[PDB]
Amino acid sequence: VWRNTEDEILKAAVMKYGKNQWSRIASLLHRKSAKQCKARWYEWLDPSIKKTEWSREEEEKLLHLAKLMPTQWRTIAPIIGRTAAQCLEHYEFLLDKAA
Amino acid sequence: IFCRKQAGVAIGRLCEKCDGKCVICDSYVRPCTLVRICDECNYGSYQGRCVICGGPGVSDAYYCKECTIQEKDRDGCPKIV
Amino acid sequence: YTIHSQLEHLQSKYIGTGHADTTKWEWLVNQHRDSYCSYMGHFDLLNYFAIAENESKARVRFNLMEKMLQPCGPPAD
Amino acid sequence: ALGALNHLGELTTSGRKMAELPVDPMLSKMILASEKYSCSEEILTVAAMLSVNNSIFYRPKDKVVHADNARVNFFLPGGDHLVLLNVYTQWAESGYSSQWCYENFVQFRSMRRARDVREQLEGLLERVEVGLSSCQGDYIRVRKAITAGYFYHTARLTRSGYRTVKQQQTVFIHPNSSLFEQQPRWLLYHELVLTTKEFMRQVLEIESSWLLEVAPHYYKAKEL
Amino acid sequence: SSSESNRDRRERLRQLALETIDINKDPYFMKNHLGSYECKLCLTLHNNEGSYLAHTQGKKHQTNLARRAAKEAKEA
Amino acid sequence: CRRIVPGQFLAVDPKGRAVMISAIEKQKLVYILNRDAAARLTISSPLEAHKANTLVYHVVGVDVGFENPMFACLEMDYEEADNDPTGEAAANTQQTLTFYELDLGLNHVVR
Amino acid sequence: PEEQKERKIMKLLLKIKNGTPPMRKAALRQITDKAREFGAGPLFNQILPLLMSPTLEDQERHLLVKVIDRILYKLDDLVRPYVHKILVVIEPLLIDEDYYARVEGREIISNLAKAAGLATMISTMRPDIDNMDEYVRNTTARAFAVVASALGIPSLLPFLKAVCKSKKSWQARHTGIKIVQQIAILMGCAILPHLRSLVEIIEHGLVDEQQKVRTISALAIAALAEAATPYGIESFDSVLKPLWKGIRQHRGKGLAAFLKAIGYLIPLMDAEYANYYTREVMLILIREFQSPDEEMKKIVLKVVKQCCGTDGVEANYIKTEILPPFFKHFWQHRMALDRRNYRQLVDTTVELANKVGAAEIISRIVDDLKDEAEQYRKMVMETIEKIMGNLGAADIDHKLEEQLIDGILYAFQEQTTEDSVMLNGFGTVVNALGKRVKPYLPQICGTVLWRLNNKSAKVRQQAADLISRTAVVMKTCQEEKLMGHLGVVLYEYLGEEYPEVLGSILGALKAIVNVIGMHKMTPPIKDLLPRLTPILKNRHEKVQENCIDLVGRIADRGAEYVSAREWMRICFELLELLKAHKKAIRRATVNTFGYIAKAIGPHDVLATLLNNLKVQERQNRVCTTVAIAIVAETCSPFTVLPALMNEYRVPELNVQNGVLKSLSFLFEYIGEMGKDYIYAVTPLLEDALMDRDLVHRQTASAVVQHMSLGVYGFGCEDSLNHLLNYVWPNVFETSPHVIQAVMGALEGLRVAIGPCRMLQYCLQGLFHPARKVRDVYWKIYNSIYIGSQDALIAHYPRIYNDDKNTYIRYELDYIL
Amino acid sequence: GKRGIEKPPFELPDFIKRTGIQEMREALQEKEEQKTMKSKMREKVRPKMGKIDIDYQKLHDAFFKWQTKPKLTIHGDLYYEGKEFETRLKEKKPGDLSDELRISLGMPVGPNAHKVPPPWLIAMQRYG
RNA sequence: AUGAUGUCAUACUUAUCCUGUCCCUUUUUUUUCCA
Ligand SMILES: [Zn+2]
Ligand SMILES: [Zn+2]
Ligand SMILES: [Zn+2]
Incomplete structure (x- = not known):
């Protein structure tokens, strides 16, 4: 590493x-x-x-996309401005906080 | 670790890996006097072995001239058993 | 510390050595005995004393070896 | 030393109660130790394993890797004995399935005779007055009952190899140990052989502290 | 060969260090007669650059540094 | 001219079979002598008699007839006289005219 | 109860078992004086079960036998009523495959029966000689041997007479006979004071009806002969005849041991007996030359070795009498197939060779060089090699030598193992043929060369080896065409890429160049060495070893059929042999740096060595720093000292330490001619003893050590004093290497500067408050004392005498 | 405790500077620090054999004709951290004068330190 | 202004290593109210 x-x-x-x-x-x-x-x-x-915390509109947009285009993280990420690994971890994190 | 059970009249010997160095000083030069060992580390399967390697006795363990100037060669069989 | 097994074997090997607690009495008595063993060994200090007092070599070495037993007073405590 | 004998050599209630068992006194002490440690079932199944072990795992040359694998699956932290424990547990879990051991590279003979020896052990268990208890997943009790039985069968680390606790004669670990690369500081075994070099089998990592817990009359502290 | 590649990787690293301590203008630096590095402030001796840079990222460098400034504005 | 290294006293056996070398404390050795085939003398490794805390006022070979040769030393023992804070053991200590003996068969020196 | 109490206080065997050696002294002394009062009554029953306890250790045994022996000396009488008990519980130890069980039971029984009440022994162990069990008879018999060691045979010999003249039991006659043979084993020389008394003891049973007693008595004859070397039948003639007749009128086990004894007496015998006895027994031998039995074979062949190896077995005698059946039945495949027979058949056949020559034995084992069991021809060359190597090949005639050389060639081709067997056979055989080998050099080489052509590496390598053996005789028979051959053809094979063959080729070239010097080599080294330089890059231990050997020879002696530029390139290639994984290579590399410094001047090689010191990874630095020392030793040190010293100024660590370590080796190597450069070097060591680092002071200290041992006796003591001032402060140190090099510097400095100066440095800190400083000063003063304890007698201070002691030495201040 | 400071490289003996080794080595240094890797290996394969020379009898006369006793310290004076820092002073035998002393006191330096009575000998003559 | 604590990688030392290592024969032990 x-x-x-x-x-x-x-x-x-x-x-x-x-x-x-x-x-x-x-x-x-x-x-x-x-x-x-x-x-x-x-x-x-x-x-x-950027390693900061998510605006609420960032997050609501995040979930909107991850429903539009499921599992396409490289395609989703640039439309909201974090790398796809960030987007992915935070999407599972919202899913599990609401789990 | 040392044998040091006191000296004798039986010469020691060197394997060929260990060929050339003094027994303690770890030199490579100017050897003056021959090595002697004890009967107990003289007998049997230990006849003619390498005081250091344990390999076969072929070349003669000797004493670096410094070791003889300081008489560290008057203690006896220094075998690392 | 196996070094120490060997090292108090060395203390057992050489009468006259020391360690960090050694007492003025052991020290000076050991040096006194050694002094005697060498007055005997060296053939000439024997003549020095034999001639200094009016004794004779048998007399000299007999004294010396008698003295070798309690040369520097009685022990410490 | 194990406590079957008084200081004059006759029978304790320990000695008799263990003697009714058609099995070695070391094992018997461990089974009694399950009484104290409330690891009854687990110590039982362990005993059942050490009864027959020598043939547990088939190790064919023509399927070495898949074999080492269906073995390496169960490898538990703590040692071979709790390994055996889980292995039996999973077999009976499968419903005493033969194809289970066939899939998982285990000698069905060893497994099922061991099950029988444990069941008749349980049929002895009422007489030897053992309460049917579980350790509730607490393998500490397990390793401790193992000690209370096999304290004698122990070695310690020496920088010149693994060497006995008492005689300080020099042993080695079996290659096929679940700890063989773990190489623990405080070791318990079950075998003492000297094949091509000195060996010990069915070994486990222990605490020297359990040794002053169990045998301060046989194992004194200064020696650990 | 890898030994010469290593020696010159080292040397290039050292010039990288001299460049950064140049562009950061450090009066708290020394290269000693054995080719190590010092902090004339914290009296720390370092083999290599990476360690020197991490030093000057002040933790105890910071403490002794602020103490240095405090006592300086004390006396003057 | 040390104190515990042999050489001060040296005796032989009257017939010419062994020599003993001896210090004034703690050390004495014995050498065995045999003609070789060509009668050119040989000398094998030495024996031992290391006994601590003991003087020697003399050593001498006793004349035995083809038995084991053996030697009469004087002795003393400064040991106690240095354990006694009173100087009593200085007085009341006695020379011990003693014999050590060979055993050429078993190759050692027995007191 | 006082008895249980006395045992209670008696268990200070714990004081002796555990504890300080102080504990040992307190308890050992107290009990060695309390031994009579405390008695062995209670002791022995406490004492036997620990001495028999399964894991009482080496020194537990040592200490407890210390105890038993000294308490038995103490209590000669106060150990009395426990004798049979001690006896039977320890007895199996003398007859025991632990030599030290034998030794320790032996010693304590010596002291036991020694201070013992005497008759007791006899009383207890009479009725056991008659006993029914051979087990107990053997145990008590070897006991009786030990008891004779303890007391002496004389006191016993009539009771032996009884136990051996018994007409009640044969059991007991066998018992006495083995008692005899047992002392004959144990005391050895010590029997000649009797020398026939035991012979008398035994005359009764070699005629006896029980084969057991008869044949153990034969072996008693054997053992007595053994301890009773050449002094012959002035004692043994009294029994020679029953042996003689039973040999033939017997069969089997008696044949075995009786043959053993008679062959042990066959040395001690004389012509008119050792002619009749041998000549008679030889016909027994001829019938036994077909004996299948193993220990038979052993005994008969050992017999024969001594027997037909005397001066009274004629050359003719053996050659017509022993040899035909001997060769017939032992020179079958079976014996070389056997693990014992191989070597022992060797032994006796080499001896018969020693007896009667080669022109018959060689002839009898020629064509066993072409048999089937390769082990067999392996054996036959094992023998032949031993034989001609000890004897020489003077009498080997024409046709004999032919079939020999040819069977040799065969063995070597046929070779199917990687063994020095056939190599050494070949080397020896031509080593002894000397100049006899002229006409087959076409044959021998042609063979070797065709092998050198083979497909598989192994045989190629073998043929290279064989060339390296016969290399010297190749020339010494003046092989112009042929040794020229091998020269140029190996220059050909120098292109191999199997390291295993390339190494052997280099070996063979070296072993040619040894015989034929440089300036008549067949490839002129002027073209050889240029070819060798691109091989030094072959990164393999064996080819690298042999290549650097060959280049070292050349640079030593040739050195002028090459150009400076060639030597410079080869220097640059040596610089990275200093990283081989084998140490022989690295020592060879350093030597050749020396030779090149001799041929070319030192300055360019020294410049190329400093630049290497700049590398990292210390193995290279250690070797190069050795090499610098070597260059300086050969070409005088003034040539190199300024450059070294000046390089001590480049501000890098590894190089300043390289300079210091190199001066270390340099002063070691030159020795007594350091009295010149000691002044030049001091201000650099004082420079590096005022700190620069741990390793800086460790290395400057090593340099001081070797300077001191070199300059012993030449008066440069002011300089070593000055450097003492700087070394002594490092005395309080912790790192092992650092404090160790410091202590070494102080022993060297002790011989070179004297022991006054160092006792004065060591005076004040002997009795210091602290304990770290007390301990270091007593460590030093111990080493100052051990060596040179006898000077100090005139160096000790004056230490005033208080009230109740005397401390001044008036001996020394008598006036005169 | 010596850890902190900066330290200047070792200073050769005169009789070794005189023989002019140091300049040879400085020159070779600067050469090989400028030269580049490719040229380094090119010189490895085609050496500049005997670039330089420095004659014997220059060396042998340094080491055997101009070698001289350095300053040594007699029995006892162990070196400790700062031992060397102590500097020869405490010149209590009156006559002890320095040249900077003479200059910054008004008196002469050199062969005239004798024939120069210092400004304190003036009031020595005046009132003692 | 130098504490120990460390699961810190780097640097470094011993002409310190590259030659001191590996898989079990045979087989046996009484038992308890069912619900
Ligand atoms: Zn040495
Ligand atoms: Zn020994
Ligand atoms: Zn060796």
Whole structure:
């Protein structure tokens, strides 16, 4: 997986080189490859991904979609602005709070 | 761990892995005096073995000249049993 | 601490060693005995004493080996 | 030491009550310990297992992996004895099904004779004055009754290998132990053999504290 | 070979560190005659960058730092 | 010239079969001597008589006839005289004219 | 009741069992004086069941036999009424497969019967010699051997006369006879004071009706012979004849043990007896050469070895008399098939060779080199190899040597196991043929080469081996075409890619270059070594071992048929052999760095070593730092010391420690010629003893140790004093390596600087408040005392005398 | 406790600086820090054999003709943390003068520290 | 202003390892009101 040290070495590398030169950033990292680099940045370390609490309209929209287009999380997520893993966990979480 | 039950007139020997080092000082040089062991760690299946490896007695355990200057070679069979 | 089994075996091995609690009496008496064993061993301090007092080598070594028994007073308590 | 004998060598009520059992005194002490620990049923079924174990699991070469698997399924935390407990539990659960053991790589012979020995044990149980109790899922009582029986059959960790508690003679764990890689610090066994190297079978992890609970006259603290 | 790749991964990491402590202008830094790092403030010795950066993310760096500022505005 | 390492006293057996080496405390050894086939002398490993807390005023070989050779040492025992805070055991201690004996068959020295 | 109380206080055997050695001293002393009053009456019944308790341990046994022996010395009389009890409960221990059960029962019974009431023994153990059970007879008989050890035979010998002259029982005559053989086993030499008294004891039963007594008495003859080495029938003639006649007029078990005894006496015998006796027994032997029986085979062949191995068995005698049936019936497949027969048939056949030569034995076992059970021809070469290796091949004539060389070739091809058997056979056989081998070198090689062509690796490797064996004689018969062959053809196979063959090829090339020097090698090393350098990258232990061996030879002696640039590339390749997983490789690598420093100058190789010190992962640093030491030792240390010292300034850890460790090894290697560079080096060690790190001070301390042991006796004691000032503060330390190197520095410094200086450093902290400091100073002073306890007699302080003690030494201040 | 500070690298002996090794090594250092990996391996395969030289008798004369006794401390003076920090002072034998002392007192430095009576010997002559 | 506590990965030490390891024969033990 990923550890504070590597995450910060990543942060530094990216912020220097730019966000499409994945192979050199991979080369900076010992035992990490460009697939994992790209994934990590675009899901957890990108600062346009927000880790806050859900507006009520966010949530009501969430449930509206997850009923419209069931199990298509990559398609749903951008229509509300969190990553699909966030959307998925919060949808099960609302389902279970109302369970 | 040491035998140290006192010395004798029976020479010790070295396996070929252990070939070359002193018994304690762990040197590789300038060996001066031959090693002697006790009867008890001399007998039987322990005849001609490696004081260190336990391997077959082929080459002669010796004493680094430092060990003889400090006379750490006057204690007897130092066999790690 | 098996090192210590060996090490109080060493205390049992070399009469005259010490440990952190050793008493002035054991210390100085051991050094006194050693002094005697060497006055006997070295063929010449024997002449020194033999000649210093007016004794003779048998007299000298007999005294010494008698003294070897309680050389530095009686024990501690 | 087990308490069947007085300090002069005659019979306690312990000694007789265990002697009516056609089974070893160590086991018998464990069964009596179920009385104290209210793990009656579980200690019963354990006894039923150790009666016959030597043939439980079929281990064919031509289906090694699926076999190791239908075995590794039941592997419980605590040791082989509660393993056997759950295995029997699940078999009878299936309704004494033969195809059950056939699916799950278990010798039906061992299982069903063990069931019979437990049932006739229960038929002895009224005479040996045992109240039919469950541990209610508390395997602590289970391991403790196991100790109260098999305290003698114990080893401890040494940095030069696993070695006895008493004689400090050097043993090894059977490869097929549910703890074989777990390698616990305070060990109980049931066998003592020396195959190609010294071995012990049907082993479990214990507390040395239960040892001062049970046998402060035989096991003193300073030795643990 | 992986040993040389490792040595130069290390060296590049070190330049990354020098760059960040340059762009963050640290007067509380030292590289000692053995190639480790110091906090001249907290007198902490570090093998590597990652540990140095985590140090300067003040917890006890923070305590001793605020104490340093307090006693400074005390005396002056 | 140590105190517990042998060498101060040394005696033989009158016939020439063994030697004993002895210190003034705690140590004495014995060496066995046999002509080799070519009668060029050999000497095997040594025996032991380590007895703590004991002086020696002399050691000497006793003349036996092809029995086990054996040796007469004096002795003493400073031991108690250093356990007694009164100096009584300084006085009232007695030399013990003693014999150790070989056993060439069983290869040891018996008191 | 006082008796139960006395036992109560008596169980301070707990004080001796558990406890401090202080506890041991208190209890041991008190009981060793209280032994008479406390008595062995109660003791023995408390005492026997622990000594028999199943798991009383080694030292529990040791201590309790300490007790039994000293309390029995104490109570010579006060142990009296418990004798048969001790006896029978311990008895099985002397006859017991635990040598130490034998020893300890032996010793305590020695002391028991020793301080014992004497007649008691006889009284108890007369009626048991007549007993019905051979079990109890053997136990009491070997007991009686131990009791004779305890007391002495003389006191007993007439009662032996009785137990052996009994006309009531044969049971008891057998018993006395085995008592005889038993002492004959135990005391050994100690019998010659009697030497015939026991022979008298035994003359009664070799004629007896019970085969048991008869044949155990034969074995008694055997045992007495054994302890009664060459001194012959000045005692034993009194029974020689019943042996003689029963040998033939007997059959079976008697044949066994009686043959055993007679063959044990056959050494002790003399011509007019050891001619008639042997010559007579030989016809027995010829009928027994077909004996199926195993221990038969053992006894008869051992017999024969000594028997037809005397000076009174003629060469002719054996060659016409023993050999035909011997070879006929033992040189069948059965004996090599057997696990015992292989080796023992060897033993006696090698001895008969020692007797009568090779030109008949070799001839009798030639074609057993072509039999079926490969074990068999394996055996025959085992023998032949032993034989010619001990004897030499002088008398082996023409046709004999031919069939031998040929059976040799066969064995080696036919080989189907990975064994040194056939290799060593070959090596020895040509080693002894010496110069006899000239005309078959086409044959021998042609064989080996066709094998070198084979498909499967194993045979290829074998043929490479065999070349490495016969390499020397290959030349010594002047094989221009042929040794030239092997040279160039192996230069061919240097392209293999089976490491197992490539290694052996390198071995064979090395073992050729050893015989034929560099400047007449068939591939000139000027082309060899350039070919070898790309092999040093073969990352395999065996090929790497042999390659670095060959390059080390060349760089040592050749070294000038190559160019500086070649040596530089090879340096750069050695730099990464220092990571092989085998230590032989790494030591060879360091040696060749030395040789290259000799051939080329030191400076470029030293530059390439420092840059390696910059690597991490310490195995490389340890080796290179050794290598630096070695370069400096060969090419004098002034060439390298400035560069090392100057490199001590690069601010990195691994390298400053590399410099310090290298100086460590350097002062070890040069030794007494450190009296020059000691001054140059001090300010760098004081630099690194004022802190830089744990490892910094650990390593500077090691350097001080070796400098001190080198400069012993050359007066550079001011410098070692100066460095004592800096090392001694590290005395309070904890890390094992650090404090250990410190202690080492102080032993070295003790011999080099003297024991006054160090006793003065150790004075004040002997009696300090603390206990950490008291303990370190008593550790040091202990090591200062053990070594050189006898100087100190003139170094101790002056310690004034208070009231009730005397503490000054007036001996030393007599004036004169 | 030595942990905190910064420390300057070790300072060679004169008679070893004199022989001019340090500059050789500085130059080689700067070379190989500039050179790049590819060129490094190119020089591994085609060495710059004998780039430099430094003659013997320069070395052998340093080590055997100009080697000299460093400053040593006699029996007893253990080094402790800050032992070296103590600096030779406590010059109680009057005549003890320094050159900065002379300058910042008005008196002369050097061979004239004798023929220069300091401004305190003036009132020594004046009132004692 | 340096506490122990740690399931912290990294750095580091011992010319410290890469050669010190593995699967059971045979078989037996009395029993209790049914509802
Ligand atoms: Zn050594
Ligand atoms: Zn031993
Ligand atoms: Zn070895």
